[PDB]
Amino acid sequence: ADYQGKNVVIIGLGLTGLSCVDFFLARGVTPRVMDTRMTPPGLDKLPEAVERHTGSLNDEWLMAADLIVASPGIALAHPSLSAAADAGIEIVGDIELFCREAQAPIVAITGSNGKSTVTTLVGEMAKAAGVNVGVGGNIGLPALMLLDDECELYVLELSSFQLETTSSLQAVAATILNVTEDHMDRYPFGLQQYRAAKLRIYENAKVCVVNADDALTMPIRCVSFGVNMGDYHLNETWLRVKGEKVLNVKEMKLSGQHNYTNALAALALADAAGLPRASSLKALTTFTGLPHRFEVVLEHNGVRWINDSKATNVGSTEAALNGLHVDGTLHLLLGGDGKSADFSPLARYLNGDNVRLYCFGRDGAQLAALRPEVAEQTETMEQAMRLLAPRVQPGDMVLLSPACASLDQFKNFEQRGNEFARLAKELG
Numbered sequence: 001a002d003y004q005g006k007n008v009v010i011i012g013l014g015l016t017g018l019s020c021v022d023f024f025l026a027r028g029v030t031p032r033v034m035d036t037r038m039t040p041p042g043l044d045k046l047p048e049a050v051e052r053h054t055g056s057l058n059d060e061w062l063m064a065a066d067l068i069v070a071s072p073g074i075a076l077a078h079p080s081l082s083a084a085a086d087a088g089i090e091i092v093g094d095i096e097l098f099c100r101e102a103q104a105p106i107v108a109i110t111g112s113n114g115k116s117t118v119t120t121l122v123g124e125m126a127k128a129a130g131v132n133v134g135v136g137g138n139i140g141l142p143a144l145m146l147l148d149d150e151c152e153l154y155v156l157e158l159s160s161f162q163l164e165t166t167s168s169l170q171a172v173a174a175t176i177l178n179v180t181e182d183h184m185d186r187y188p189f190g191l192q193q194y195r196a197a198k199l200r201i202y203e204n205a206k207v208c209v210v211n212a213d214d215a216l217t218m219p220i221r222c223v224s225f226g227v228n229m230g231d232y233h234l235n236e237t238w239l240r241v242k243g244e245k246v247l248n249v250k251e252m253k254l255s256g257q258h259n260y261t262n263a264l265a266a267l268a269l270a271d272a273a274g275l276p277r278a279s280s281l282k283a284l285t286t287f288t289g290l291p292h293r294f295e296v297v298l299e300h301n302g303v304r305w306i307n308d309s310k311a312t313n314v315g316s317t318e319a320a321l322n323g324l325h326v327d328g329t330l331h332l333l334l335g336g337d338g339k340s341a342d343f344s345p346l347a348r349y350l351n352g353d354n355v356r357l358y359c360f361g362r363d364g365a366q367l368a369a370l371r372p373e374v375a376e377q378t379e380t381m382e383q384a385m386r387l388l389a390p391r392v393q394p395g396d397m398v399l400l401s402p403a404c405a406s407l408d409q410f411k412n413f414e415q416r417g418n419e420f421a422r423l424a425k426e427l428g
């Protein structure tokens with residue numbers, strides 16, 4: 001697309017907003033940038049020639065714009081932004097800008113849990129085939145920074161927020177891995193509205209890949225994956241495609257059923273994107289996992305300290321707890337900004353004599369109320385760690401799986417996971 005001479009306004013001075021500033025500058029367009037945060041993180045890195053407005057949205061800028069580029073962290077329902085939409089002013093996000101520019105097939109992945117794992121796996125499968133692949137999006141590397149003429153395949157992790165502002169995505173293969181309650185602070189029409197954002201990923205997708213065990217992943221036919229059913233399903237555990245064994249999961253470094261269905265989803269996408277299955281299976285055997293995703297950061301004196309800081313919603317923490325074997329006591333850390341989630345689905349995991357909860361952050365009290373007689377509540381994760389650490393015995397597990405966003409107290413979930421790992425190494 002061509003932006004020359006257009007009045008471009010970017011909302012968001014984070015990672016996305018900075019990559020858009022550079023995008024436009026490289027195209028001979030100086031945008032203006034605003035953010036409702038008084039001192040947003042990207043303020044320091046903004047080129048000096050770019051006008052910026054912080055502490056609020058600027059309606060004079062918004063109503064004057066030819067194009068508004070909204071970072072995923074601003075709600076389209078923001079009254080300033082709905083006013084501009086009502087005036088007919090075009091509003092896109094960075095993924096939309098990317099789709100207009102990208103000149104290779106895109107594999108697009110969203111879901112409440114499993115997103116980064118499946119995105120990375122497809123990237124590894126591409127690489128195993130010798131394909132020049134760009135991997136980014138919500139996984140952390142702004143998509144516009146992937147744009148490269150030598151690139152042969154793009155693998156995008158996409159959030160519901162990013163999908164809301166995207167209209168030009170025509171994925172070669174698209175999946176919603178699963179839909180579970182998240183971001184309810186951004187969706188006042190609840191689960192179905194959230195689901196509706198995610199369902200945009202299927203629009204104009206050549207192959208849609210659905211979770212046969214999750215009805216909400218299906219369009220209101222798709223290739224399916226599931227546990228007992230699906231085109232890609234599980235059979236010691238085997239990955240199968242239509243009844244034929246393709247991989248004994250003992251070859252995988254990843255474990256857990258939810259990761260075997262992740263592997264199925266990734267293989268489905270890779271097959272649809274045309275990647276050779278043999279090299280795709282190869283990548284499945286090499287991939288060791290992601291940082292902050294059920295990551296053992298210390299195993300010492302018969303205790304494992306596990307960094308699952310990436311568990312920022314209830315479904316993710318369920319995937320940690322569901323089927324979890326612990327020889328002694330599980331010391332479970334929960335806490336942060338729960339984004340108005342119902343935490344009560346976690347209750348069925350917290351029974352018995354071998355569980356201790358340490359709840360912190362903004363929604364610490366609602367987390368501790370899950371089972372009051374086994375729960376401590378502190379203000380911070382550090383206080384919680386120093387509380388639990390004396391109590392830890394050989395055989396125990398210490399699990400940070402906080403079911404919450406970290407934004408109330410931390411820069412991001414990575415920072416939260418790093419601080420846990422330092423304290424584990426200190427106290428363990």
Ligand SMILES: CC(=O)N[C@H]1[C@@H](OP(=O)(O)OP(=O)(O)OC[C@H]2O[C@@H](n3ccc(=O)[nH]c3=O)[C@H](O)[C@@H]2O)O[C@H](CO)[C@@H](O)[C@@H]1O[C@H](C)C(=O)N[C@@H](C)C(=O)O
Pocket residue numbers: 011012013014015016017034035036037071072073074137138139140141142143159160161407
């Ligand atoms: C909230 C969000 O969608 N974050 C994704 C985004 O990061 P970026 O730094 O660009 O975010 P942003 O849009 O500036 O928003 C960050 C924070 O700033 C706040 N913010 C943002 C703009 C504004 O004017 N006002 C304001 O208060 C937001 O509400 C949010 O609390 O773009 C990055 C590159 O694509 C992503 O990696 C990053 O995903 C993270 C890791 C995430 O938490 N995503 C959510 C959606 C999730 O996975 O569930």
